[PDB]
């Protein structure tokens, strides 16, 4: 196809090679990503009277960079620009430079336009099916069939239209599930403007912070003045809060880069901001209405970080065709099959000199279109659509209907540990420290000096109507105190009879000290007094040395509670003595740090949700395998994996890249008792021993030393930790080439790039609705946040693989015996007449029908479907029964043959009118017989499928199929069977042919279940 879409560009403009003035230029796509495309070069006017020549492809702009390179290179950004320009920006002046700038860098713009229902149409005929289907139908207009060939065409169009109509009205979902714009107070000719997202352009001035409406960051902004909370769980996967800092105390000296300063001075885009900390009214500058943190834009559009991995997926790759290769060699096979009897017809034909012979080509292609059937691409989208039909019906959404059979067939899969299996909410387990051992006492135990730490040491504020808001870490800190916090800054026991204490000055967590600091006074008891209590708590490591007397065991205690991977942060109270009014004051914020005293430690970590585990074992259960893969702090990881089961071995080693280069990489566990360095040979021995797990700093040294080694690897790593966003993918795609199936649920940003590749992506939705980013590029999508969804969806996939086997083995034995019965009949001028042709017709299509809308079962077993319709059991089943059924046709056709009287014409008139006979009855009889016997058999029922007897419209349809053949051997009703146009056969021969019915059938499900036994 792109190949072919430069032939149309060659036909409309000649090549061109002089550089002085270009109508178009090619698209090179590199063989990674991308598709060839042709886009038109754009003249601007220039002001200090140079051109620049540009291009827009996959929404990035390049430009021509005559000057230095002489080559095509990117738009350059403010990356680049030193530390020092911006400490004295103002911010843009005019709107004469606004528009410039908006040209010649873009647009804030991320909004989807869904591809045009003309343009789907378009893409849905390109379908070779569709093609064969409209070559049929053009068929039987030249057979004079041509009113059935109109009324077969619409249909197939209308339910074509049908189909692209269910996708658009997904695509719907997603378009609303897009971020819709929304307002942002921006800084614009020396004023602030209330401006959308959308026209916000790059160099402009504005005040972000804590929005009410719970909305995300629009994009990539440097923090020029004020403190914020940034949670980018969504974006970057660490589940912990990261401070940010202002630039303005920065010396100027210094040159910014995206890769050294990313963490603390730039904000990124998509996620969500916390708490913002107004900066002092001392400091003059920048002053926002909002009073939020006045910061500087420095990318927009799809050249974010955020924007970046959307982007780079949303014209990445292709949507896999729903046409693959087996159902490529299928009808190959069958088709090889028709022209066997084609031939075969075409030769006796042309042994008769009398017959015409474009007639006996007529009749030759219309059993070729016969053999294969029209409904072959219409029942598998049936059955298809009957499985999303029951799909959605818990809660959860398919963007991409085809690939629901692929969920049989996979054998990982993959989950993202914050977000997915970790809630967002955190619940504090205890106030270690308190108590001897290492044993975690409760809050209720714990001493009120304790309690009065924990109380008073909190950045959380008040709203005007109240509502607690700040770090989750501080708000379960408040909660498990369960004080209430006034409005004015006052913290109020609940239920214990002590004092409120008043904060003062709050000073908040500084990155370079690692340590945060809370004045305040409380009230002596009888006594009008004050007494200045300061609590501190901050970094544990740091602020050991702050404590005046430490426990010995302080250092042993921080260790074990840092292996369990709980955020642990040590709690601090100074008595400080007796402060004076004007010396609080006079005393610095930092000051109080000094001769502190140890109270304990506080471990907070993230709690999994209820029906994790239970999910996980019925997975695991399934001769599944579980990898995590998350961007979180690898012991965090190892031990919810290990709380979770997906490791049960006694030992974990992490795999670490060298600090010296040229040394061999060497793993540690997490223990420290075993290390070993890596092996050039398999790691099965060490899998065996104990699971293994990569960071994603030993992914990217591997990377770049030898793939080979990191492909070896990938399969037995069971946990996945601090891995990009990129890196997600490759590690997917890594699992994808060596024939894994790969399944994955995520629900941040991070997870789309390898959401996007896997092969049945699902997307949840964490605290369940805001149906964030990663639903975009997912297949599928759940608004539940549940894992439960991936369960669900498991056994829907079991039921629809299992269901398709069956429709291709019924189809593919139905037309055999058809084609060959049509062939060798109609030959020998043994014909049915057309009400009963039509008969079968209809209960074939009807008996189709309810297959196609079997039901899964409750729960899931051990047995593994087959992967796929090419094995050696499904071709042996299906050649088996054809020639068991085979021998019985043909021991019919020849007890019938050897009764009826003489033949009075050597040659076969073939337009000769239907008469009634007891060969033709003889061979319906058996046809029917081939039916019933073939949708009896086929049907593979559990522990895969609901059994036979449930599916009750099939076993209708069976029993009615049944009870006509069984009417029509009997021949009780004269008036039947003379409507049938059959003659009546003597009793004595009914014998033989019902015996020989019972035999073929009897012989069929014994081979069938014998093979079954065999091979299964």
Not at 228 to 234: G, K, N, P, S
Not at 579 to 587: D, F, K, M, P, W
Not at 706 to 727: E, G, N, S, Y
Request: charged share 20%; aromatic share 10%.
């Amino acid at each position: 196809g792109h190949w072919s879409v430069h032939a149309h560009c060659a036909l409309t403009c000649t090549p061109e090679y002089d550089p002085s003035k270009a109508t178009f230029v090619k698209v090179v796509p590199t063989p990674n990503n991308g598709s060839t495309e042709l886009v038109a070069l754009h003249r601007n006017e220039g002001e200090d009277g140079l051109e620049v020549l540009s291009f827009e492809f996959q929404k990035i702009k390049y430009s021509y960079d005559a000057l230095e390179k002489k080559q095509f290179l990117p738009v350059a950004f403010p990356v680049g620009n030193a530390f020092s320009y911006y400490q004295s920006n103002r911010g843009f002046q005019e709107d004469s430079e606004i528009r410039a700038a908006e040209k010649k860098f873009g647009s804030n713009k991320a909004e989807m336009v869904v591809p045009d229902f003309s343009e789907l149409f378009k893409e849905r005929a390109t379908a070779p099916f569709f093609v064969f289907q409209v070559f049929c139908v053009g068929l039987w207009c030249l057979d004079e069939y041509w009113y059935y060939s109109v009324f077969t065409l619409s249909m197939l169009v209308a339910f074509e239209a049908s189909l692209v109509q269910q996708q658009m009205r997904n695509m719907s979902e997603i378009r609303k599930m897009g971020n819709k714009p929304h307002m942002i107070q921006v800084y614009r000719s020396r004023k602030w403007r209330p401006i959308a997202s959308d026209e916000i352009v790059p160099g402009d001035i504005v005040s972000i912070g804590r929005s009410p409406q719970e909305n995300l960051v629009p994009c990539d902004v440097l923090l020029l003045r004020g403190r914020c909370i940034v949670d980018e769980a969504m974006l970057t996967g660490e589940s912990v809060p990261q401070m940010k800092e202002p630039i303005e105390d920065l010396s100027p000296d210094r040159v910014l880069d995206l890769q050294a300063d990313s963490r603390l001075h730039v904000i990124f885009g998509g996620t969500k901001v916390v708490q913002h900390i107004p900066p002092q009214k001392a400091t003059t500058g920048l002053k926002p209405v909002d009073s939020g943190c006045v910061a500087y834009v420095l990318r927009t559009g799809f050249n974010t970080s955020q924007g970046k991995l959307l982007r780079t997926i949303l014209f990445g790759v292709k949507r896999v065709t729903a046409n693959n290769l087996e159902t490529f060699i299928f009808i190959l096979f069958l088709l090889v099959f028709a022209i066997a009897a084609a031939a075969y017809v075409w030769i006796e034909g042309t042994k008769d000199p009398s017959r015409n012979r474009y007639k006996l080509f007529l009749e030759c292609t219309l059993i070729l279109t016969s053999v294969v059937p029209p409904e072959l691409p219409i029942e598998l989208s049936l059955a298809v659509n009957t499985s999303l039909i029951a799909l959605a019906k818990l809660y959860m959404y398919c963007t991409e209907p085809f690939r629901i059979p692929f969920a049989g067939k996979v054998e990982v899969c993959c989950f993202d540990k914050t977000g997915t299996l970790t809630s967002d909410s955190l619940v504090v387990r205890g106030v270690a420290g308190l108590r001897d051992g290492k044993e975690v006492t409760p809050v209720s135990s714990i001493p009120v000096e304790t309690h009065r730490a924990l109380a008073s040491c909190h950045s959380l504020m008040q709203l005007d109507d109240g509502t607690l808001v700040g770090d989750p870490l501080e708000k379960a800190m408040l909660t498990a105190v369960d004080w209430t916090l006034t409005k004015d800054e006052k913290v109020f026991p609940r239920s214990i009879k002590t004092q409120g204490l008043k904060i003062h000055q709050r000073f908040h967590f500084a990155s370079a000290l690692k340590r945060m600091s809370v004045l305040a006074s409380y009230e002596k008891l009888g006594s009008t007094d004050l007494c200045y209590i300061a609590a501190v708590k901050g970094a544990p490591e740091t602020l050991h040395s702050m404590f005046s007397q430490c426990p010995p065991d302080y250092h042993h205690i921080h260790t074990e509670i840092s292996r369990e991977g709980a955020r642990v942060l040590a709690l601090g109270y100074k008595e400080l003595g007796h402060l004076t009014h004007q010396q609080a004051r006079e005393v610095k914020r930092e000051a109080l740090e000094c001769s502190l005293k140890f109270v304990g430690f506080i471990v907070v970590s993230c709690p999994l949700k209820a029906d994790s585990k239970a999910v996980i074992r019925e997975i695991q259960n399934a001769s599944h395998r579980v990898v995590m893969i998350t961007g979180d702090n690898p012991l965090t990881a190892c031990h919810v994996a290990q709380e979770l089961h997906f490791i049960e071995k006694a030992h974990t080693l992490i795999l670490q890249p060298p600090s010296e280069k040229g040394r061999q990489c060497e793993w540690r566990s997490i223990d420290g008792s075993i290390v070993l360095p890596l092996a050039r040979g398999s790691p099965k021995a060490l899998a065996l021993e104990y699971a293994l797990c990569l960071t994603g700093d030993g992914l990217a040294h591997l990377q770049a030393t030898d793939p080979q080694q990191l492909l070896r690897l990938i399969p037995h790593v069971q946990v996945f930790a601090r891995v990009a966003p990129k890196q997600k993918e490759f590690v997917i795609t890594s699992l994808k080439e060596l024939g894994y199936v790969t399944l994955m649920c995520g629900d941040g940003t991070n997870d789309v790039g390898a959401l996007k590749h896997a092969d049945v992506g699902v997307a949840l939705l964490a605290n369940a609705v805001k149906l964030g980013d990663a639903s975009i590029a997912a297949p599928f999508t759940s608004k539940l946040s549940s894992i439960q969804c991936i369960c669900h969806v498991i056994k829907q996939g079991r039921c629809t693989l299992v269901t398709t086997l069956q429709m291709f083995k019924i189809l593919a034995l139905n037309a055999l015996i058809l084609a060959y019965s049509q062939s060798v009949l109609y030959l020998e001028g043994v014909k049915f007449s057309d009400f009963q042709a039509t008969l079968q017709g209809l209960l074939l299509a009807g008996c189709f029908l309810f297959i196609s809308r079997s039901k899964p079962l409750k729960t899931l077993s051990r047995e593994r479907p087959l992967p796929n319709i090419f094995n050696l059991y499904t071709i042996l089943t299906v050649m088996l029964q054809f020639f068991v059924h085979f021998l019985s046709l043909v021991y019919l056709y020849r007890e019938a043959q050897a009764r009826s009287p003489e033949k009075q014409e050597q040659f076969v008139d073939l337009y000769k009118e239907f008469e009634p006979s007891l060969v033709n009855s003889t061979v319906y009889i058996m046809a029917m017989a081939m039916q019933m016997a073939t949708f009896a058999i086929n049907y593979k029922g559990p522990p895969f499928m609901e059994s036979l007897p449930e599916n009750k419209p099939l076993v209708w349809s069976l029993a009615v199929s049944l009870l006509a053949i069984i009417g029509l051997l009997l021949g009780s009703s004269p008036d039947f069977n003379s409507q049938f146009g059959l003659v009546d056969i003597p009793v004595e021969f009914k014998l033989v042919i019902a015996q020989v019915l019972l035999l073929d059938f009897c012989l069929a499900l014994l081979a069938d279940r014998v093979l079954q036994f065999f091979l299964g």
